[PDB]
Structure 1
């Protein structure tokens, strides 16, 4: 079964890369302005220093994650002023200078769907990220402009200019299809690419569950913080929950029991919160590493790993940013309408047996031809497309035919 047409397809993948940084003060959360609470908690050891160290480590680890997936090339490139990429239309991915935001229409659509207080209280602080969105957008724009005008060369050394049709011809001659197919159906390929890239906005704007992966971490963090805050209204087996009333209607020789019980309860609650945060950060870092690998392999070069950079034979990929995440658009090539054929392992001329150099033998029913393994184009068997090895006695299923000779003119 040999395909006779093809179809360019575009798929989307979403990968989280970071989670919001946060920090809590050990002393302030447990004890307020009460100094007696402070010097009662001083009885315990370094339980107010390990937690801050762990949170700081988590914060710096999250800071490092973004730099690994967006700082592959330290040389920002610019697109040419005139867009004449052989009919291709990269308007929905390239940045739009008209809008005050430096994003693209797809990036703008993404940033308007992540939308779902907590200013400051009880020693709850949120640190700002080192890299703002305005610079992640610049990194993505530079990466996008690098592949359009240079191919995969800029990912290994100096950037080499290349015409886009020639680059696509290079990429087809990486999966089996020869060069002439693109140079013939340039218009069809361009139209299919434009339609596929257009349909992405419609697909994203209609599915609320498309961006579900990025919302899960935000919701989990919000629920964890809400539980941590709500845990402050529990008596923990004492007479009350507010230290002020404990300090009033009791004696200092007796009031320490409630203070100690509340301290123990709040300390173990904070322990649970910190452990949960560390466990979540582990998976977030794993996902960030996977995203970095995907960016390095799919974008800056063609990948031959099956079902890694999209579904089907991989051709190209484009990166886009999103709030605490990245989105990959994989452009792939898949076969189409097929045809029925009969075959033969080898062709037996006089004595010698012929094997194809590249491609296989297909029989229309009367004649025979040799063709490629992924696109149907028959050619007459000659001495250039086949090589002789052995005799028509050991191979199984060989057939009979005539191998054309290309030097018949010399007879004249």
Structure 2
């Protein structure tokens, strides 16, 4: 977002700007802070998503050992090059007057199609090249080889996977198919992004409602005071209106900074999970899912990301 420090405080009256010139050195700092948050928010998605400098594409045929990946790879039939999971997320996640009072929003530098391409390249690299593409040149590896090598990373011998890959593929397909109705059953989890939107959306809404306020003045409307009063006594209302609107702006800017700090912290954590849980097999407990971790897949979302952690757990036990 961006704001104009004159249009918000004052209408089309030069005298309000003249009395604003008494302070002067406030909204320059406000604009500098706002554009700092804007460029930081533009920067934030770049190291989260754009981590590979070589965009890949999937091969046409899919001899993926019986594993089904049609839910996560982009569908060419849909005009938007996205995945059905991404379509579900876009459907489950839901103005000009806000744009018309000196407050503007700015489009992101990266659109949805380019970040979709980045994610598609990420799945292509993590499917057909293993995890070697996060270090240097990508080296192609068949998917059962990669699955056995991930089984080897949790203290399990590789013969188990080659012995039971049919059951592994069936379990993977069933678990993948469960996740669509798991997401569509309740909108609670997607609330983790909804609070990002409406708290922002109400943030200007409680500000734009503060225009119609008698901040010790006769009226919130400005020009009728000039048309009614006599100019040497108009200042005693103009100054208190100006100071009240300045306090509202200061509070809004401070609250935006407070939100942006923890948003940047969450973005840094998401970048870390992109680095470790996706491009490798992290051995940290509970960090990349629940139980022993095998892999993870990224999916885009409106102003966010979602990880699908593929993990492994034991089922039955016997005493000896």
Q: TM-score range by the shorter chain?
A: over 0.9
1:117 to 96, 99, 119: 96
For the residue of structure 2 that corresponds to 1:339, the secondary structure is: coil
1:126 to 66, 90, 105: 105
Counterpart residue number, 1:186: 165
For the residue of structure 2 that corresponds to 1:49, the secondary structure is: helix
Work out the CA distance in 2 between the residues paired with 1:232 and 1:213.
31
Work out the CA distance in 1 between the residues paired with 2:96 and 2:186.
28
For the residue of structure 1 that corresponds to 2:307, the secondary structure is: strand
What's the Cα RMSD here? 1.1
Work out the CA distance in 1 between the residues paired with 2:113 and 2:127.
22
Work out the CA distance in 2 between the residues paired with 1:307 and 1:118.
46
Work out the CA distance in 2 between the residues paired with 1:118 and 1:320.
33
For the residue of structure 1 that corresponds to 2:169, the secondary structure is: helix
Work out the CA distance in 2 between the residues paired with 1:28 and 1:116.
18
TM-superposed CA distance for 1:120, in Å, is 2.2
Structure 1 150/116 Cα, relative in aligned 2: closer, same or farther at 3 Å?
A: farther
Structure 1 116/320 Cα, relative in aligned 2: closer, same or farther at 3 Å?
A: farther
Structure 1, unmatched stretches of 5+, are 1-21, 341-412
Work out the CA distance in 1 between the residues paired with 2:88 and 2:100.
34
Deviations for 1:372-400, whole angstroms, at most 9, x for unmatched residues? Answer: xxxxxxxxxxxxxxxxxxxxxxxxxxxxx
Work out the CA distance in 2 between the residues paired with 1:143 and 1:120.
36
Work out the CA distance in 1 between the residues paired with 2:281 and 2:238.
64
Q: What TM-score comes out, normalization by structure 1 length?
A: 0.76
More helix by share: 2
1:320 to 290, 299, 302: 299
TM-superposed CA distance for 1:130, in Å, is 0.3
TM-superposed CA distance for 1:116, in Å, is 12
TM-superposed CA distance for 1:68, in Å, is 1.1
Deviations for 1:229-284, whole angstroms, at most 9, x for unmatched residues? Answer: 01000111111111111001111111111111101110111000000000000000
Q: What TM-score comes out, normalization by structure 2 length?
A: 0.98
Structure 2, unmatched stretches of 5+, are none
TM-superposed CA distance for 1:325, in Å, is 0.2
TM-superposed CA distance for 1:45, in Å, is 3.1
Structure 1 118/181 Cα, relative in aligned 2: closer, same or farther at 3 Å?
A: farther
TM-superposed CA distance for 1:117, in Å, is 4.3
Equivalent runs, 1:145-294 vs 2, <5 Å: 145-294=124-273
Work out the CA distance in 2 between the residues paired with 1:199 and 1:309.
20
- Counting matched residue pairs gives 319
TM-superposed CA distance for 1:219, in Å, is 1.1
Counterpart residue number, 1:66: 45
Deviations for 1:123-177, whole angstroms, at most 9, x for unmatched residues? Answer: 0111110000000000000000001111111111111111100110111011011
Deviations for 1:14-45, whole angstroms, at most 9, x for unmatched residues? Answer: xxxxxxxx011111101010101110111113
TM-superposed CA distance for 1:118, in Å, is 3.7
Work out the CA distance in 2 between the residues paired with 1:173 and 1:99.
38
For the residue of structure 1 that corresponds to 2:6, the secondary structure is: helix
Work out the CA distance in 2 between the residues paired with 1:333 and 1:256.
71
TM-superposed CA distance for 1:185, in Å, is 0.3
For the residue of structure 2 that corresponds to 1:241, the secondary structure is: coil
Work out the CA distance in 1 between the residues paired with 2:38 and 2:102.
16
More strand by share: 1
